[PDB]
Coordinates of C-alpha atoms (C1' of nucleotides) in Angstrom, one line a residue:
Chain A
X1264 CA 25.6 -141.8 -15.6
X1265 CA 24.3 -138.6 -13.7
X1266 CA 27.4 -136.1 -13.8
X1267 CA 27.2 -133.0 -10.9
X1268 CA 29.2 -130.2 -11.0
X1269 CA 29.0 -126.9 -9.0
X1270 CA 30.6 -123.6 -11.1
X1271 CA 28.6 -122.9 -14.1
X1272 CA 31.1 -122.0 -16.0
X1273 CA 32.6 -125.2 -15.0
X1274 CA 29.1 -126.9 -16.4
X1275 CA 29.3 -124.5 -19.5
X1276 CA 33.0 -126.3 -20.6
X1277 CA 31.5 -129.3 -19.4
X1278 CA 29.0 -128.6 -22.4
X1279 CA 31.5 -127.5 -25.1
X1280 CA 33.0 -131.1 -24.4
X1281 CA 29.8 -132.7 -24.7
X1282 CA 29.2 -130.9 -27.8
X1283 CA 32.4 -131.9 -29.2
X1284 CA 31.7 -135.3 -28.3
X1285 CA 28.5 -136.9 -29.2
X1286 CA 27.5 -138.2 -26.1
X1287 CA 23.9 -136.3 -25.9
X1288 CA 24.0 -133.4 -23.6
X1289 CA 20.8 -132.9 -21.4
X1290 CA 21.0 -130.5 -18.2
X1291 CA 18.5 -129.0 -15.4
X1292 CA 20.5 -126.1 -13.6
X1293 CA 19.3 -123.6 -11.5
X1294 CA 18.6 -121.2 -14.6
X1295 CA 16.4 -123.7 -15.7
X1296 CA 13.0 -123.0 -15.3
X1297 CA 10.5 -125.2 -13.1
X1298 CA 8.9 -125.8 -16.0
X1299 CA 11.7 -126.9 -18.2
X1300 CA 12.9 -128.9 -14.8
X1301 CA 9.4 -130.8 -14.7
X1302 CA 10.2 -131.4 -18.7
X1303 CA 13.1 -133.1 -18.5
X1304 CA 12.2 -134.8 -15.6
X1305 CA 9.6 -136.5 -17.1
X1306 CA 11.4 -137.2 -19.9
X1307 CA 14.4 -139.2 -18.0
X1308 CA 12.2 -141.7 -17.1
X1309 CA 10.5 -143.2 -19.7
X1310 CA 12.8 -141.9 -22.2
X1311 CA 16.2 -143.7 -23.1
Chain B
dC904 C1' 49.8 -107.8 40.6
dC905 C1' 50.0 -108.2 34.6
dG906 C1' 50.0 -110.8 30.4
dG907 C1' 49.5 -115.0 27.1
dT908 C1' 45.8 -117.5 25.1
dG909 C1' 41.2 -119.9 24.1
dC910 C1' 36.4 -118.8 23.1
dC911 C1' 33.0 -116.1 21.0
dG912 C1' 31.3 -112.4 18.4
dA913 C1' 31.4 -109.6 14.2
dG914 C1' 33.0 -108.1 9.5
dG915 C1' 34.5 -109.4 5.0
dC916 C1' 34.6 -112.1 1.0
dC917 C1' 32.6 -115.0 -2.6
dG918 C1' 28.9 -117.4 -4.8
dC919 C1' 24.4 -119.0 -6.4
dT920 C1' 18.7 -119.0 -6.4
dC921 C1' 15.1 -116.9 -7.5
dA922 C1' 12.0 -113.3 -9.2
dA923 C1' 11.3 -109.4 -12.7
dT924 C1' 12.4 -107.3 -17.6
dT925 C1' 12.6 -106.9 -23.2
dG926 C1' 13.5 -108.3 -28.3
dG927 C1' 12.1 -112.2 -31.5
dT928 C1' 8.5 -115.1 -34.0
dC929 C1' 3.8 -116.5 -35.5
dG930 C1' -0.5 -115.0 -37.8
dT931 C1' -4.3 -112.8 -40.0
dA932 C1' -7.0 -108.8 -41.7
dG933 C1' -8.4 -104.3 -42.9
dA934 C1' -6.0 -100.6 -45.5
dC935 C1' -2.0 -98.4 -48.6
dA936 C1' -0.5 -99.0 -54.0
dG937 C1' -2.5 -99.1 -58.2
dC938 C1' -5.1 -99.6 -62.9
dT939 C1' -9.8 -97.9 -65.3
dC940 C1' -12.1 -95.3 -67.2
dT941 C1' -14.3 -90.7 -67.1
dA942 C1' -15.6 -86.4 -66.9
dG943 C1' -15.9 -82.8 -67.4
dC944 C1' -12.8 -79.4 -66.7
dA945 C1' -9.3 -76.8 -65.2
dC946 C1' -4.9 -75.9 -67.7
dC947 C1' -2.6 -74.6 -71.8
dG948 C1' -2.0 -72.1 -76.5
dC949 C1' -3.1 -68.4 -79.0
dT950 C1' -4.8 -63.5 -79.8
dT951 C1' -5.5 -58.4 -78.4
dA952 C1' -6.5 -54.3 -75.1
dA953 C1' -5.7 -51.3 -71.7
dA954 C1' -3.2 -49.6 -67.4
dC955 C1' -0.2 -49.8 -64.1
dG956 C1' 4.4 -50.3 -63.3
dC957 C1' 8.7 -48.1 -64.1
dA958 C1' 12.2 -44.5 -64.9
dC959 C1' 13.8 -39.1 -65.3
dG960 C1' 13.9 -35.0 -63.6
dT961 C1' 13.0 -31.7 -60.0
dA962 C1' 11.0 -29.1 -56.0
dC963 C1' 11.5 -29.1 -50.9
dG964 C1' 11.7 -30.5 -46.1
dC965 C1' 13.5 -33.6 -42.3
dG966 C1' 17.5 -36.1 -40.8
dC967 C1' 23.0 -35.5 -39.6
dT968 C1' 26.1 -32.2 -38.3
dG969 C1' 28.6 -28.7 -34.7
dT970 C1' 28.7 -25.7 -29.6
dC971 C1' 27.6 -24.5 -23.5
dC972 C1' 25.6 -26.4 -18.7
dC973 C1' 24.1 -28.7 -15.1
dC974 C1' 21.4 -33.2 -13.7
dC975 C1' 21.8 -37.8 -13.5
dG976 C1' 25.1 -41.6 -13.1
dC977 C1' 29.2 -43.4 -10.5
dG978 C1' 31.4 -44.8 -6.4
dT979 C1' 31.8 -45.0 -1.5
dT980 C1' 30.2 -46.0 3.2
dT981 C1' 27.4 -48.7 7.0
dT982 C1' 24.0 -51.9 8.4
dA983 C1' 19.7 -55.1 8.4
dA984 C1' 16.1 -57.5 6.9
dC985 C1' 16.2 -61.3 3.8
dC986 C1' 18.0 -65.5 1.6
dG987 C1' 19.4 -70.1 2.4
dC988 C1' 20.2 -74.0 5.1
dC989 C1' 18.7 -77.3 8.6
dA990 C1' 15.4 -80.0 11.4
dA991 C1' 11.2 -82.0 13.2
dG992 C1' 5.9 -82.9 13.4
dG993 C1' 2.2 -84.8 10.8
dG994 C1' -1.1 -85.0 7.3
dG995 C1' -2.3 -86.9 2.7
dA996 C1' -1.5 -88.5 -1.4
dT997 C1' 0.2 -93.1 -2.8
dT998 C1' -0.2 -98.0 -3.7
dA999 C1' -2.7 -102.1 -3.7
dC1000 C1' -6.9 -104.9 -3.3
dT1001 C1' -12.1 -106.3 -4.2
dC1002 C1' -16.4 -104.9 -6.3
dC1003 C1' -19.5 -102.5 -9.3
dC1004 C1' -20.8 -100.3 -13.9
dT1005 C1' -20.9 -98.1 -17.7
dA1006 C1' -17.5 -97.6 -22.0
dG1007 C1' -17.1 -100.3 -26.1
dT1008 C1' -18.6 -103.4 -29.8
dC1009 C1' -22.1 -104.3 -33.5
dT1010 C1' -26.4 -104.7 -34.8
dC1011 C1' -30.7 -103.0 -36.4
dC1012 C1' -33.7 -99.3 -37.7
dA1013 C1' -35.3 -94.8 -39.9
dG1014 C1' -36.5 -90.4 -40.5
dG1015 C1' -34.0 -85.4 -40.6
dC1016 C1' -31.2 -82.5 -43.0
dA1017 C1' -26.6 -82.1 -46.0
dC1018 C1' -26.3 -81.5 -50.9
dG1019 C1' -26.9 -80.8 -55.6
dT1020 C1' -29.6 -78.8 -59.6
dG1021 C1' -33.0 -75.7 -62.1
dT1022 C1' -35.4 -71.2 -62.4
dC1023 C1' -35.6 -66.3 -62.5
dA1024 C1' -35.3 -61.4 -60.7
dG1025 C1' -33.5 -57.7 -58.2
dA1026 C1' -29.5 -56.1 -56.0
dT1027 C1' -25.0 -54.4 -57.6
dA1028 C1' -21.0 -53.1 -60.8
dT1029 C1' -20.3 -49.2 -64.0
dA1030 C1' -20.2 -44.6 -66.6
dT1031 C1' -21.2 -39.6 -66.4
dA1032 C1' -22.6 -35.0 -64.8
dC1033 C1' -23.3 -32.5 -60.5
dA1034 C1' -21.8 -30.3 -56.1
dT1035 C1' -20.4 -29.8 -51.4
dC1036 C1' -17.9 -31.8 -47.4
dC1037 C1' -13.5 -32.4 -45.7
dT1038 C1' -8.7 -30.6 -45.7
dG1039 C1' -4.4 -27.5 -45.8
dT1040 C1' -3.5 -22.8 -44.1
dG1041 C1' -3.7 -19.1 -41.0
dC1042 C1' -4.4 -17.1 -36.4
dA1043 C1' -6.6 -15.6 -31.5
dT1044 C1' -6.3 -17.0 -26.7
dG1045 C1' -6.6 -20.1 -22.6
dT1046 C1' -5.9 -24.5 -20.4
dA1047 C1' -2.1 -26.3 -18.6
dC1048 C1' 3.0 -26.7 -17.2
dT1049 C1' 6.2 -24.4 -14.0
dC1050 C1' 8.0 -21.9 -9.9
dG1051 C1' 7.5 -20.7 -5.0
dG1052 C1' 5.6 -20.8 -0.4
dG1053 C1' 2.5 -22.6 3.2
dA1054 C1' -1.0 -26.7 4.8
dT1055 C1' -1.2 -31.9 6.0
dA1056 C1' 0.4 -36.1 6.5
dT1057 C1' 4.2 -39.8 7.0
dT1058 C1' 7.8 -42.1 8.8
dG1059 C1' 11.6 -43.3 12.5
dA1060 C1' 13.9 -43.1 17.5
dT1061 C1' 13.1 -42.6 22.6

DNA sequence: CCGGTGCCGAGGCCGCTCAATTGGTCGTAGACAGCTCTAGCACCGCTTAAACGCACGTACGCGCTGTCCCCCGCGTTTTAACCGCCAAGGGGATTACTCCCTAGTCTCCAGGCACGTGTCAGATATATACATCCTGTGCATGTACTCGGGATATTGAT
C-alpha cells in the first residue's frame, strides 16, 4: 500500500501511529533530500 | 433617463518547495603532564660589623588668617551666518568570475657566527691629605613694565 497525505503535521501523526504500530514506516517528503529521495527509491524496488 | 447585476480585475489569505546555515561525530598526531636524575647552585642557617634609619628637641620661615576698591562676570537685547535637513547627478568601490604565480611545504646542504670557557692585566673602587670652586649674602643700577598721546592700519555701510 502507497499512503498520500498533504499536511505535514498530518504525515507527522501519521508517523507516531506507525510507530506505535509495527507496520515499518518509510517516507519521501518534500524535506527529504534528492539524495535521500533517490535512496529510497532505489530501495522500493528490489527491496521487500 | 438611472439602477440592478454579471464579468473581470485585484487584494488578501494560507501553504508548501527549495536553497542556504550551524552543532555533532569521526580520527589521528604532534605537544602538554610528568618522572629522572643531576648539577651545580642559588637558597637557607648561622655568625658578626657597621650605618643608616629613627625619634627628641628646637630654631625659624611660609602658609592661613583679617580689611577697602574697582574690573571682570552676569544678564539683557537684536540679528545673521551657520547648522541641519532634503534631494538629485554620477562616479567608483563592490562583487563575482577566470587565469596566472608565487607563498607554502620539506628536503637537502653547509659554512658563519652565537656561545661558552680559560687566561691575565689594567682600569676602577677606596682611603687620606690638600685646596679652591661654587654658594649664600649683600647691594648698585638699568632693562623693562606702565601711562599717555599721536601715527597707521582695519573694518563696515552707502
Amino acid at each position: 500500500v502507497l499512503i498520500y497525505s498533504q499536511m505535514t503535521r498530518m504525515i507527522d501523526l501519521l508517523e507516531e501511529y506507525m510507530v506505535y504500530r509495527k507496520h515499518t514506516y518509510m517516507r519521501l517528503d518534500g524535506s527529504s533530500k534528492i539524495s535521500e529521495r533517490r535512496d529510497m527509491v532505489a530501495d522500493f524496488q528490489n527491496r521487500n
